[PDB]
Amino acid sequence: PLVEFLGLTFNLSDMLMITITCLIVFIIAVAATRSLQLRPTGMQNFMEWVFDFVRGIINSTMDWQTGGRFLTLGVTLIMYVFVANMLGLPFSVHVNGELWWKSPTADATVTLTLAVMVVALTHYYGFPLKIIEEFANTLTLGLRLFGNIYAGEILLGLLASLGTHYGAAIPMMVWQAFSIFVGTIQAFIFTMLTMVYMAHKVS
Amino acid sequence: IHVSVVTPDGPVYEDDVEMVSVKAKSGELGILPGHIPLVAPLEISAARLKKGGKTQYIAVSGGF
Amino acid sequence: LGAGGASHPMLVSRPVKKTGYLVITSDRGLAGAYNSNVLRLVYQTIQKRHASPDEYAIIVIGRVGLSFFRKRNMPVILDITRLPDQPSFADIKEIARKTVGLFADGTFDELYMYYNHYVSAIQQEVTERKLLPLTDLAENKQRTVYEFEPSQEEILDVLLPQYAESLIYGA
Amino acid sequence: SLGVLAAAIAVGLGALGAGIGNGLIVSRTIEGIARQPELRPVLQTTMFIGVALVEALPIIGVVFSFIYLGR
Amino acid sequence: SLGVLAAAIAVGLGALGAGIGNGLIVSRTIEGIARQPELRPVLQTTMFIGVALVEALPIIGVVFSFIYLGR
Amino acid sequence: SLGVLAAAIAVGLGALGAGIGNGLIVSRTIEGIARQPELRPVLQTTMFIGVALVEALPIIGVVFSFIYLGR
Amino acid sequence: SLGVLAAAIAVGLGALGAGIGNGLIVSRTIEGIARQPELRPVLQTTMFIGVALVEALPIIGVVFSFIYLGR
Amino acid sequence: SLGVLAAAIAVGLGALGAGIGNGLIVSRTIEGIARQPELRPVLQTTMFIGVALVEALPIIGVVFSFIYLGR
Amino acid sequence: SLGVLAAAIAVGLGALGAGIGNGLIVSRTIEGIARQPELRPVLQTTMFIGVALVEALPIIGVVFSFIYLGR
Amino acid sequence: SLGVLAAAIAVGLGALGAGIGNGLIVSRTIEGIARQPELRPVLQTTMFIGVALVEALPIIGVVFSFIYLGR
Amino acid sequence: SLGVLAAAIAVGLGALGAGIGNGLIVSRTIEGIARQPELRPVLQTTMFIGVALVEALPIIGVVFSFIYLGR
Amino acid sequence: SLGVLAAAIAVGLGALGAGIGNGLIVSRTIEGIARQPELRPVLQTTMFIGVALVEALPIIGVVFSFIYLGR
Amino acid sequence: SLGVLAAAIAVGLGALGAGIGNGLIVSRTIEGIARQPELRPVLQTTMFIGVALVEALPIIGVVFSFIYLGR
Amino acid sequence: SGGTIIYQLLMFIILLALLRKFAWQPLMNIMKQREEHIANEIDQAEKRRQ
């Protein structure tokens, strides 16, 4: 399970998982936003429910006039992190090489650069103790999502090997239901703490 | 020392009883002399005056 | 009056969007200037400072005040009548708990009492006593600290309606 | 040889801290909904928010314990 | 050599964390049902949800203890 | 060698966790039965299932200490 | 060689757990009989079944520390 | 050679558990004294049997510590 | 060799301290928004600055843990 | 040999237990004086006999620490 | 050569103490702003000077850990 | 040699126990003179005798740490 | 040799005890000035003499840590 | 080929089957509650206009 990199500069498998999660998020977004309907049904009501959910979170943290801009960053951020956490659970394939296609959030560099991208955005829209608190909250957000996905990934993998090598269906079943629970809770706390620091720096 | 049960209509039962065990809305209570100043809203139940050798039940509605 | 205690809605004065009125008249006539003085002072204090029928609500006690405010087309939201000559506590208790619970819904935001104060047999002074919020309060020249058995808040939630009912029954 | 019990004390102290923090949070949530049932959805919401926040920093100790077992 | 000691202190600190957290949440739910007895099913269902969410990290400590025992 | 020290530290930490957790549960349920003594069977069944959880995770801790002593 | 130190940490941690548990139980029952004085026999019977209930696992930890001292 | 360390930590953990348990029971039995004076004999009898309960295991610990030092 | 165990106790004690601190803060803000639910933002911002403090000292501890690991 | 740190860890755990127990009981005597300052003699005499009870087992531990240091 | 273990236990115990102290202070101050809101600035300043004290002793602990690892 | 470790440990656990006990006694006397300020001198003087009582034995541990450092 | 981690366990346990006791004192003084604000200078002066009284013994633990490190 | 892939994918499928027997009734009722709520909100306005 080594870091398989075709190029010396960057991990190849992480780029593959970023591309596949971007395409699956984009196609579920355009499948939920096919046509305009004033009476919501099907999946457009689901997309509007996620949209008003993100909006509600923004309304909890800040005034609606200040935080109205962030709604379309926040909904793609929660859906992106949501699908990025749930991709690691079904397949997690092992090839004759090092490793291929685990999940993007299990990579520490992916989650830490997504967290520092979040904080770069909330510095863009917006004394040593304040800046060390800033670097502290960046790295604890990135390490939060990275750890709480990567431990479950390793455990699921361990369970998979224990089952295949030699009766053990329900422990990994209970853990895998708990892991999609961890995925949706981590996506929600990630976008909510994103909006908290956005509200803290805007107003 | 002594208990005094009053009503807006008029006082009902004033005696010399050293033990009362009226039920408050949190739960049971027990009062002997030398007790701390304590305040309890009483539930709709009976107060037990059991210090004169035999118990004496007195009901409260509203209650305090 | 001790350890704060102003967190309850019946101590602190909320902003005023309405005003309740508890008017105490008689069921029967042949009293000379009893009902005339009470209903005149209530009509003056209502028409002086509101100028809108939606900004007040009136709770009458007595058929004379009820007929007064139905001749003058005013709301008589709580309207019990037919009291005995020496009234007990239960018949005023049910309208008193309805009055306090109608304050606690956020409707009245304050209310007043209007009644004739019996001094000695010939005057019968008209009083305007503010029922609640309980801002006007005074300690009994010496105080002992209390232990609150559930908490302070539940004791206030039980006690302050009973104090309002006792004020209403005394008036 | 020493990295094994290094990883073990790391995951053990993480489990201890997360257990105490989760116990404090969840116990206060259920006594709060015992005080009144009308706010149990918002108290369960902030319950899971709190459980994530106290189970977050021990699991970075867990994955760092795996790093310690790696070296 | 040190793997069995590692395994044992890992499962022991997991047991300590789960015991303290479960003791807190169960104690507050029984004083909650002692305070208001008509809230017993809601209180004990949220208590079992709390048992799961305080024993999340000790249970993973147990299987990582088996990893530590295996090495 | 280290296996007996492992088994004993597992039993010791499980005993300490069970002691603190069950002490919290039993203490709050006897003060709850001191408040409202008509709720004796409900409080006793809930303290028994809570104690069953708080004991039963150190129970598997103790049998894991037995298989640590075997190794 | 390490079996005596094993039995020692086992008996010591079981003693600390039993001490905190019995302290919680007897402390809350002494404030409980301080509140409602006529509930003393029910509170004492539930207190003693709680004390035996919380020292159940420390005494079996002691009698397992004996065979830890042997092995 | 480590039997002296074994006996010493057994006595120390017994003293720490006995100190916490006696601190809890004496502390809120004097709270029970301070709330009402008239129940001083029954509060003190339940106090001293609680002292016996929280000290008994500790006493066993120090006797077994002398057995451990003899080993 | 011992730098691995040094980094491990550093991250473990930091995780334990951050877990207990975050558990206390979020516990009492649960009961704060349960007593007075209209004070949710003024409780929430002070909650998050407390979380920032009680994590930020174990965060610089776990930042130092890697230079403990290297040596 | 290591009997010196044996004696010292006995002194240390006895000091920790005596400190926590004495702190609890004298703190709640202050709380009881604050509730009712006219029973200061009975509260202080029950305080000092509780201090004797909490202090007794660490003093026994420290004289055994003297017998442990020599060996 | 044990200076890395020295500095790491120093940073870890300082982080644990600062975490528990900051958790207590921040938790009671959000309960203070929860029971009454109108002097949140009065509460916050004394909260921050308490945080300053309970971290300023582990800050000099961390600096002393730096000069421990230097030796 | 290892007597330095002995003395430091005694000093450290004496400081920890004295810190927790002094924190309990001073914190509860803050609450005590906060609720009834007209009583302040008598309860702060019995607070000071409680302070001397809770830190009597850690000073004895400091003296014994001088003895252990001498050995 | 081991004097550096002797110095460090002294500083670490002193910092942990100072953190817990100081957190208790500051938390009770802010809830005291929260429930009645007019006694802020009195409560802060007795809080500062209390925290000086607590951290008196960890500071002499730090200078004893200095003479342990010099050893 | 590895053995873990089809094993955990098969149990993910049977977990979705259990979650289908357990979970299609709540969230479809939540979506139907939202749809009926917004239809009644849309409906009142059209009636109010008429």
Author numbering:
A (entry chain a): 6 to 131, 152 to 191, 198 to 234
B (entry chain H): 4 to 67
C (entry chain G): 58 to 228
D (entry chain c1), E (entry chain c2), F (entry chain c3), G (entry chain c4), H (entry chain c5), I (entry chain c0), ...: 2 to 72
N (entry chain b1): 7 to 56
From the paper:
Adenosine triphosphate (ATP) synthases are multi-subunit protein complexes that use an electrochemical proton motive force across a membrane to make the cell’s supply of ATP from adenosine diphosphate (ADP) and inorganic phosphate (Pi). The passage of protons causes rotation of a rotor subcomplex, inducing conformational change in the catalytic F1 region to produce ATP while a peripheral stalk subcomplex holds the F1 region stationary relative to the spinning rotor during catalysis.
Three conformations corresponding to different rotational states of the enzyme were identified by ab-initio 3D classification and refined to high resolution. The 3D classes contain 45, 35, and 20% of particle images and the overall resolutions of the corresponding cryo-EM maps were 3.0, 3.0, and 3.2 Å, respectively. As expected, the most striking difference between the three rotational states of the Bacillus PS3 structure is the angular position of the rotor (subunits γεc10). Bacillus PS3 ATP synthase is found in a conformation that has been proposed to allow ATP synthesis while ATP hydrolysis is auto-inhibited. In this state, subunit ε maintains an up conformation and inserts into the αDPβDP interface, forcing βDP to adopt an open conformation (lower, dashed box). In contrast, all three non-catalytic sites in the cryo-EM map are occupied by Mg-ATP, while a Mg-ADP molecule and a weak density tentatively assigned to phosphate are found in the βTP site and by the p-loop of βE, respectively. The cryo-EM maps show that a clash between subunit ε and βTP blocks the central rotor turning in the direction of ATP hydrolysis while it is still free to turn in the direction of ATP synthesis, which could explain the ability of subunit ε to selectively inhibit ATP hydrolysis.
